[PDB]
């Protein structure tokens, strides 16, 4: 087990319903030189992120939603995507009036890649990995148009105006989404990102609805996560359906956030529940799972890759409520079967 202090409170990798992600650093796979690149709200400068960490890019367009004060550039922080006075439309909706900064990206970055047995805070599933934050999501979310660019350079597409990727990603993280269906332009830079080499893991999302009816669960090439609890059931607000591939832990799931709730104040980790949380539970064990694959000299295209994944998960603890993937990932299972 890692040193890390609060790694006993990370039920999510090692426990009943976890990914059994401790079972593959037994073995000594911790996704070593695989690079799994995360588009989101950008990354903190977070003391338990930053030797996991390359450099990434920052795709956000407009000034408004970036709060950087220019479109695109090469630093992809988060500069934090606090609202007030509905900022973010919905008014009057009281719900919808103003949110603290989520530091969403680097929750997401920690559970594929914290820095581990460095003693503070948490542990990363692929710890040996490196990630690749892509910012495309600032004050009140993103553009498609940024995203899919962002997704498409992730995987070693040249955009014009950008330099080219030295850290092309093998999986690329997409915890995000929203209604409807995948726009042309998504799933034409999605099939681009997947013939390049890359496996698109993406968020089922959260209205406790079917994933079919958002994207880009609704995309081809995609491998699509509902979110379990620490109960090994459907959280309640899991999209499900035939769309979703697998799930994994996605309730009370512990990361490394920042506690401010506007700008960064200091170096935090935080509980945080959705399908953005399961997600990169998959993404860790795809990088787990590739470094096992590269020991013994073995290409797994994304097809393959996903086809691991999903053929390999644990039970769900009784009977679900719905359609949720084949079960939870499982980092033991599915390393021991490329390893033969
Ligand atoms: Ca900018
Ligand atoms: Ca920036
Ligand atoms: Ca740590």
């Known amino acids: 087990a890692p040193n890390d202090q609060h790694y006993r409170e990370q039920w999510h990798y090692f426990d009943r319903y976890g990914v059994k992600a401790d079972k593959v650093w037994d073995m000594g796979f911790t996704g070593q030189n695989v690079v799994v690149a995360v588009v989101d709200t950008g990354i903190l400068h977070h003391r338990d992120l930053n030797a996991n960490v390359l ?6 367009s407009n000034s408004q939603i970036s709060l950087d004060g220019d479109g695109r550039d090469a630093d992809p922080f988060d500069e934090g995507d ?19 900064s989520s530091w969403h990206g680097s929750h997401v970055a920690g559970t594929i890649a914290a820095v581990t047995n460095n003693r503070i805070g948490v542990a990363g599933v692929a710890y040996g990995a490196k990630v690749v934050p892509v910012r495309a999501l600032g004050r ?3 553009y498609d148009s940024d995203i899919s660019d962002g997704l498409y350079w992730a995987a070693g597409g040249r955009i014009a105006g950008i330099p080219e990727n030295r850290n092309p990603a093998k999986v690329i993280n997409m915890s995000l989404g929203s ?27 959260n209205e406790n609805q079917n994933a079919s009816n958002t ?19 459907r959280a309640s607000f899991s999209n499900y359906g035939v769309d979703v591939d697998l799930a994994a832990p996605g309730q009370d799931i512990l990361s490394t956030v920042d506690s401010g709730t506007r700008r960064p104040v200091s170096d935090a980790y935080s509980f945080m529940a959705g399908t953005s949380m399961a997600t990169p539970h ?10 096992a694959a590269n020991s013994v000299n073995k290409n797994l295209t994304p097809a393959e890759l996903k086809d691991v994944l999903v053929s390999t998960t644990s039970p769900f603890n009784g009977r679900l409520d719905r ?4 079960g939870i990932v499982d980092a033991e299972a599915a390393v021991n079967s490329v390893l033969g």
């Open 179 to 205: 209604d409807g269906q995948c726009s042309y332009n998504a799933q034409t830079m999605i099939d681009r990102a997947t013939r390049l080499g890359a496996l698109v893991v993406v968020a089922a999302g």
């Open 55 to 60: 450099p990434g890019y920052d795709f956000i």
């Open 140 to 142: 009140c979310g993103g």
């Open 215 to 233: 994207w880009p669960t609704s995309c081809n090439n995609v491998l699509s996560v509902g979110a379990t609890t620490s109960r090994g059931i």
């Open 323 to 326: 359609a949720l993937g084949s």
């Open 282 to 291: 998959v993404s860790g064990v795809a990088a787990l799972v590739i470094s």
């Open 82 to 100: 606090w609202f007030d006075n509905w900022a973010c439309g919905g008014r009057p909706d009281p719900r919808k009036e103003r949110s603290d």
